[PDB]
Amino acid sequence: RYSIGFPSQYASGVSEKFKKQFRIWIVKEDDTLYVIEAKCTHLGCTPNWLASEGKFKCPCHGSGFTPDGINIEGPAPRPLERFKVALGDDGQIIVDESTRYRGERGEWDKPGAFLKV
Numbered sequence: 671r672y673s674i675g676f677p678s679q680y681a682s683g684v685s686e687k688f689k690k691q692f693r694i695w696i697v698k699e700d701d702t703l704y705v706i707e708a709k710c711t712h713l714g715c716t717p718n719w720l721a722s723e724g725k726f727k728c729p730c731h732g733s734g735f736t737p738d739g740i741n742i743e744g745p746a747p748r749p750l751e752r753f754k755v756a757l758g759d760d761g762q763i764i765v766d767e768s769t770r771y772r773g774e775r776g777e778w779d780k781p782g783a784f785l786k787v
């Protein structure tokens with residue numbers, strides 16, 4: 671549970687603001703904003719946004735992820751997890767890390783999984 675500011679403060683694509691501090695990527699996809707835990711779901715390393723290649727490269731066992739977190743290569747077996755994102759009373763985005771949405775169980779499609787912006 672913390673704040674990552676106003677939706678305006680982001681552009682489409684991948685932001686690495688709170689990567690060092692909160693171990694997250696904040697991604698605005700087409701219509702929407704969502705928050706990716708930078709935690710490889712192979713064993714546990716911290717992968718690396720690679721804008722050139724449109725990819726989060728995990729340096730642990732090569733695992734590759736698309737900009738939406740989908741596991742596309744390497745040993746990683748499932749997409750990178752996502753956190754609940756809500757607008758506060760002050761309009762700023764609260765992230766709640768103790769709720770998580772698993773893209774391969776249709777959890778990205780349920781409330782708090784993203785913000786429409």
Ligand code: FES
Nearest residue numbers: 710712728730731
């Ligand atoms: S922990 Fe990321 S590839 Fe193994």
